[PDB]
Amino acid sequence: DPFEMAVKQLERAAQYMDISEEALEWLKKPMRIVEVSVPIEMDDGSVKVFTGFRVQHNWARGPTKGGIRWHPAETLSTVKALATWMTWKVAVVDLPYGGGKGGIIVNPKELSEREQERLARAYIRAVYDVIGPWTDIPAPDVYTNPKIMGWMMDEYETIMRRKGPAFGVITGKPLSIGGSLGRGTATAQGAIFTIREAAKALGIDLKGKKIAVQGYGNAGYYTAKLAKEQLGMTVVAVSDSRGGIYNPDGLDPDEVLKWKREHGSVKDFPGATNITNEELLELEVDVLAPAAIEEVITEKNADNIKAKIVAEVANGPVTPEADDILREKGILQIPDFLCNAGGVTVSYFEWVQNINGYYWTEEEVREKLDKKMTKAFWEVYNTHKDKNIHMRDAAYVVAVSRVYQAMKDRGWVKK
Ligand SMILES: N[C@@H](CCC(=O)O)C(=O)O
Numbered sequence: 025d026p027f028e029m030a031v032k033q034l035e036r037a038a039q040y041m042d043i044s045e046e047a048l049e050w051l052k053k054p055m056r057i058v059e060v061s062v063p064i065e066m067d068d069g070s071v072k073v074f075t076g077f078r079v080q081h082n083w084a085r086g087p088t089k090g091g092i093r094w095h096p097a098e099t100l101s102t103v104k105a106l107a108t109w110m111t112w113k114v115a116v117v118d119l120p121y122g123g124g125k126g127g128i129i130v131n132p133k134e135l136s137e138r139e140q141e142r143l144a145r146a147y148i149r150a151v152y153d154v155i156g157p158w159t160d161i162p163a164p165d166v167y168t169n170p171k172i173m174g175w176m177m178d179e180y181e182t183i184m185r186r187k188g189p190a191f192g193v194i195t196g197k198p199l200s201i202g203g204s205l206g207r208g209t210a211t212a213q214g215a216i217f218t219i220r221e222a223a224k225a226l227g228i229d230l231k232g233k234k235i236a237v238q239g240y241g242n243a244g245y246y247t248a249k250l251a252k253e254q255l256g257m258t259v260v261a262v263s264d265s266r267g268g269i270y271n272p273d274g275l276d277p278d279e280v281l282k283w284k285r286e287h288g289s290v291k292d293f294p295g296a297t298n299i300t301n302e303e304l305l306e307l308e309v310d311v312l313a314p315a316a317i318e319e320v321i322t323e324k325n326a327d328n329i330k331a332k333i334v335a336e337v338a339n340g341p342v343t344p345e346a347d348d349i350l351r352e353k354g355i356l357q358i359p360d361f362l363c364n365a366g367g368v369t370v371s372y373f374e375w376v377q378n379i380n381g382y383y384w385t386e387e388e389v390r391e392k393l394d395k396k397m398t399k400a401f402w403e404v405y406n407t408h409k410d411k412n413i414h415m416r417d418a419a420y421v422v423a424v425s426r427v428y429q430a431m432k433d434r435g436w437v438k439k
Pocket residue numbers: 089090091162163164165195367368371
């Protein structure tokens with residue numbers, strides 16, 4: 025189970041910090057769980073009822089935040105674990121947010137556009153009483169995009185009778201309706217800032233160094249592109265779920281994306297040697313950025329990693345055994361919920377823009393993301409040095425300490 029795995033992670037974290045038993049018990053349970061029925065009328069005229077969730081783990085630091093998943097395998101346990109994870113994610117990067125998560129047990133592939141809009145509007149009508157600009161801010165997630173976010177915001181504004189900032193009730197919206205710039209490259213930009221800070225900490229100059237990326241979706245492609253331009257690095261290996269390519273002199277991510285668009289995959293790229301993911305993970309490269317399916321670095325290949333920095337852009341792509349093995353080699357790891365925290369920071373920026381009624385630009389959003397990511401990385405690294413623990417442990421310590429301090433300040437826990 026995912027919620028048990030999350031709870032265990034929290035206990036393991038609490039082992040390295042001084043936290044009261046009552047606070048741990050409080051943090052082991054979501055503060056509010058809402059399970060609703062989401063009825064929509066289909067194209068054939070029949071009415072089908074779906075199961076929707078909205079978990080608000082903790083709101084000591086402020087309104088909860090988290091996306092909505094439309095997955096046929098959604099469970100309450102998954103939503104609860106992801107909300108718990110979102111709490112620490114927003115706490116490590118110092119946002120005035122709590123942890124939240126929603127989901128609908130639905131296969132969105134079998135739904136038409138009209139049915140998808142009806143599902144979004146019905147979900148908003150079902151969970152209206154627990155969401156709001158200052159209560160709970162949903163966001164795009166697996167199988168949800170900005171189109172669904174716009175439909176959801178419109179339904180919320182219709183119910184809300186335009187009595188306040190209905191734009192800020194949800195993030196990831198289209199630019200025409202409370203849209204925020206930088207929302208396509210948020211995760212990659214945050215990962216690049218964290219990689220730059222890690223290289224600064226290790227004393228490595230990234231100008232001309234090597235990078236390898238696993239997974240060539242939005243995150244992987246934009247990570248490679250931003251690395252090559254901003255950090256001046258030599259992209260030598262990229263890979264999708266199909267296969268990988270290698271070229272020591274350097275690859276051009278734009279051309280690789282064009283090839284992927286044409287032939288359907290990065291396989292057989294001209295001037296490059298076709299390889300598989302497993303050997304791709306073991307090239308002698310300065311930094312490694314797994315941006316693909318989780319649990320790629322395990323005990324089987326942990327000792328074979330030759331990268332000086334491993335940036336876990338993906339969601340937990342490294343197992344704890346591989347974590348210990350990599351730390352034993354001196355390889356610096358950026359924790360998964362610290363590396364890809366650029367997505368929630370830009371969502372916070374979007375919420376601020378919506379609340380204020382004044383939107384920013386591309387340079388403004390990029391400048392702020394730099395500040396937030398640099399400060400979060402330095403906080404985690406300072407905890408890393410002071411407590412002499414793992415990088416992932418330090419991030420948990422920082423997040424749980426912030427949430428615990430907020431809880432103590434409100435008087436929720438007296439000790
Ligand atoms: N991190 C989740 C949701 C958080 C947010 O964007 O507000 C996502 O990938 O969308």
